[PDB]
Write a protein that binds this ligand. Sequence first.
Ligand SMILES: C=CCOc1ccc(S(N)(=O)=O)cc1
Ligand SMILES: C=CCOc1ccc(S(N)(=O)=O)cc1
Ligand SMILES: [Zn+2]
Length: 257
Amino acid sequence: HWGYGKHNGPEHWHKDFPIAKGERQSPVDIDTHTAKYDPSLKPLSVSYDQATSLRILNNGHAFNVEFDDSQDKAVLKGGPLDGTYRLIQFHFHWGSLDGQGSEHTVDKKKYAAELHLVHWNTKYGDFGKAVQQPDGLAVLGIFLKVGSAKPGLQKVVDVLDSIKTKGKSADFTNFDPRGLLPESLDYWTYPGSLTTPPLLECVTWIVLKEPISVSSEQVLKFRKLNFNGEGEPEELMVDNWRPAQPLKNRQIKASFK
Ligand SMILES: C=CCOc1ccc(S(N)(=O)=O)cc1
Ligand SMILES: C=CCOc1ccc(S(N)(=O)=O)cc1
Ligand SMILES: [Zn+2]
């Protein structure tokens, strides 16, 4: 089973998931000087007012806050996207130290963590079909830096004690993901992939320029989670990020000048 350890981490993934060495892998370094402003890019439309969170799950790789995606309740549209993409879950990647944890980097800078809000293109009917399409998913990525607390994150932080180990889930209703966004929706965008196996090349990445700030105490609580299941040897869930992959034949576009 793949993971983030010395013996099953990102350098090993290609042996079971050969697309790991593909033409549009994620994450990437965002070279801010080389990214080109695209004045034809529309503003993002984030419509989360009717979002229905259901549950939070430790899946052994991260924790997912899951949403009801059986109707257009929380959707992403506009920007580089054609059509409507429904929010299915969000999760984070984070480090063992404040100086690493993000998957995307900005001029080689690593942030302490990165939030991924995962959406699937409604024209494909469900998430499983969507991941088989080159325009199946839109993932909104948001960097986290350590400073002031993010009040809208605290409800997530406080439930983590109940899902410490792999396979644990807890009810998690009425959570409003709007509380996780920064003020600005300026973004970079490029075609890429899932950043974990199966590494499918199905994602339009939309990475916000403005990080959110979270407190040291908030990120410390992420680091108390476990990769392992209950009753197994404890391995802290930290450094669950894939490093930047070759950009290859891609251009990163900026929504802003
Ligand atoms: C649960 C936290 C909610 O966070 C926000 C934060 C801002 C808004 S808005 N765009 O209406 O001013 C709505 C919800
Ligand atoms: C197809 C099952 C796995 O689903 C996902 C969904 C999203 C991601 S990521 N880190 O690229 O946002 C990784 C794996
Ligand atoms: Zn992710």
